[PDB]
Design an enzyme around this catalytic site. Structure first.
Site, mmCIF file in Angstrom:
data_model
loop_
_atom_site.group_PDB
_atom_site.id
_atom_site.type_symbol
_atom_site.label_atom_id
_atom_site.label_comp_id
_atom_site.label_asym_id
_atom_site.label_seq_id
_atom_site.Cartn_x
_atom_site.Cartn_y
_atom_site.Cartn_z
ATOM 1 N N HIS A 211 -4.802 8.622 -51.495
ATOM 2 C CA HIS A 211 -3.578 8.097 -52.036
ATOM 3 C C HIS A 211 -3.466 6.775 -51.694
ATOM 4 O O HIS A 211 -2.941 5.829 -52.207
ATOM 5 C CB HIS A 211 -2.419 8.683 -52.460
ATOM 6 C CG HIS A 211 -1.503 8.732 -50.925
ATOM 7 N ND1 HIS A 211 -1.599 9.865 -50.211
ATOM 8 C CD2 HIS A 211 -0.861 7.980 -50.313
ATOM 9 C CE1 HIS A 211 -0.783 9.818 -48.969
ATOM 10 N NE2 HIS A 211 -0.329 8.506 -49.147
ATOM 11 N N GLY B 274 4.654 5.074 -43.898
ATOM 12 C CA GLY B 274 3.545 4.771 -43.130
ATOM 13 C C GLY B 274 2.954 5.447 -42.073
ATOM 14 O O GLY B 274 1.815 5.297 -41.586
ATOM 15 N N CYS C 12 1.414 8.316 -42.921
ATOM 16 C CA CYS C 12 0.323 9.091 -43.800
ATOM 17 C C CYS C 12 -1.059 8.637 -43.182
ATOM 18 O O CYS C 12 -1.287 7.418 -42.494
ATOM 19 C CB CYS C 12 0.136 8.340 -45.371
ATOM 20 S SG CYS C 12 1.427 9.119 -46.480
#
Ligand SMILES: O=C1C[C@]2(CCOc3ccc(Cl)cc32)C(=O)N1c1cncc2ccccc12
Ligand SMILES: O=C1C[C@]2(CCOc3ccc(Cl)cc32)C(=O)N1c1cncc2ccccc12
Lengths: 296, 300
Positions: free
Chosen positions: B41, B143, B145
């Site tokens: 993503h 942030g 991820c």
């Protein structure tokens, strides 16, 4: 979201861990520049040390044997001078911490790190760690920016299962000595400022059931705190909690009236941040760091 | 002595964390050899949140659209491919800090360490368990991820988790390092809910054995139970069924303490019925379920 007991990344400290063997005793050493620091009980003090030669100390960094070229003692820590500076030496400093302050522990066996955990210097100067035989020399530290502040070196376990150690200058935390003798930890107390910081972390994470409309005086809260074996809350502590108070809209003395009700009435089957006890091993700075995502 | 929630030393993983930027999106990547792994993503835009077609978005990208930063050094991307929900960016430099590693998919109840990162920089390390509903109860902000879950067993790092998203209840969902999600989750902003969570029974029993090894015996009783009778009780308290595999796994701790598994099961039944009555077990007033039988043996 989420609130976990979180340690500092241990990489900078892992690069410093060595094995120190003298006679039949093997423990861990901290290799910074050309000096290896470890507990002085590895010689088992002025008389025992004078009988030792540099070659009696076997220092191993990985599969490499370091050569000791000097040895001296500073309080309860032994300093072995080596021929090689540790190329992995981070920016560091030695700091003595106060009770209530938290730090990360890199637990080691035979100069090899096995685990990392967070803990707090108890008001009775013990730490509730997790250590087995061979863990002596394991270190406690914090990270400020890119600088490692070494604050603890592990020496022993008390009869109650709690742990005792020194700062990196060899000064013990608490009324302890480094010998097999009758030694007991004093009665422990709860770190009040840390509980309040953890109640602010719970509010930041959506847990508000314990909040009430009430406030208290600092003096009235301290009377209640003494009664429940809680450390006194000082004006310094109130000031330190200011930013969390501003972020959540709950004044420090307002959070104190919530704590006071929790102490007199309990949780009543409820939990706060997945705990049924009041957690006291998170400082106000830890809460701000975790709820803002500070990196190292 | 002592029993703490303990994470693995994170050094081997820290030397693998990089920052990955695609347009306005920045997250963390895992740099192993000449490949950077990260949540796919990172290629999504605001308009592609609900229903992204990742194959279509990826084909429109070129190598120079991916900015990878390892410290103050920008790595050059020379290839890109997608494996399930993970993007693999081939780079022109092998990570000199690559440890001995492997990718492992774990089962619910299994524990691992999480190295939480923001902008390719590690900020903290903590211990986690894969919940029976396939979520993790982490501590993650925007942030995070790309942050990874791992175990370390004799020099080898087994990567078992990559963080992808937060569900509405505050719990977290992610994939193994092959991009396969744990649980019925998808990497879309569509309505998703974690199923009702349950307590990891085998882990609670392992933790009761850790308490006995550490000197606490107050919760023990003279009773034993059948495996079936324990399960009928346990499920009424939202506890996972205990299987014969679990009973077998607890065998070494049973041998070390002298308390048969079904005897410890009777102690657990009583604790569920009575509560703790102002007492604690290993400094906790709740039954702890994020320590596996393997963790207990390792630590004790
Ligand atoms: O390895 C040692 C040496 C010892 C035991 C002997 O008597 C002394 C005397 C002085 C000093 Cl400084 C340390 C010790 C000690 O407490 N430990 C341990 C240290 N932390 C945890 C432990 C758990 C289980 C057994 C041992 C443990
Ligand atoms: O950074 C992201 C991207 C996002 C946000 C949008 O919704 C989706 C939908 C799908 C995917 Cl795979 C990722 C996301 C997400 O959950 N997170 C977070 C991840 N962990 C913790 C977080 C905390 C607070 C806000 C966000 C968080």
């Amino acid at each position: 979201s989420g609130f976990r007991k979180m340690a500092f990344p241990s990489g900078k400290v892992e690069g410093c861990m060595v094995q120190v063997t003298c006679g039949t005793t093997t423990l861990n050493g901290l290799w910074l520049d050309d000096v290896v620091y470890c507990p002085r009980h590895v010689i088992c003090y002025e008389d025992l040390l004078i009988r030792k030669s540099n070659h009696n100390f076997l220092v191993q960094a990985g599969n490499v044997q370091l050569r000791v070229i000097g040895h001296s003692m500073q309080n309860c820590v032994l300093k072995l001078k080596v021929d090689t500076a540790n190329p992995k030496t981070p920016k560091y400093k030695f700091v003595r911490i106060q009770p209530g302050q938290t730090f990360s522990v890199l637990a080691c066996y035979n100069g090899s790190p096995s685990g990392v955990y967070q803990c707090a210097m108890r008001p009775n100067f013990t730490i509730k760690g997790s250590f087995l035989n061979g863990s002596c020399g394991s270190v406690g530290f914090n990270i400020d920016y890119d600088c490692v502040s070494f604050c603890y070196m592990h020496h022993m376990e008390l009869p109650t299962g709690v742990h005792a150690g020194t700062d990196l200058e060899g000064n013990f935390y608490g009324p302890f000595v480094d010998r097999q003798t009758a030694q007991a930890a004093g009665t422990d107390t709860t770190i009040t400022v840390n509980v309040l910081a953890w109640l602010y972390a719970a509010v930041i994470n959506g847990d508000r059931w314990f909040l009430n409309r009430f406030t208290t005086t600092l003096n009235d809260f301290n009377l209640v705190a003494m009664k429940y074996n809680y450390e006194p809350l000082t004006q310094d502590h109130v000031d330190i909690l200011g930013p969390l108070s501003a972020q959540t809209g709950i004044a420090v003395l307002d959070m104190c009236a919530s704590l006071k009700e929790l102490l007199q009435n309990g949780m009543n089957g409820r939990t706060i941040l997945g705990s049924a006890l009041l957690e006291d091993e998170f400082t106000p700075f830890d809460v701000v760091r975790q709820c803002s995502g500070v990196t190292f």
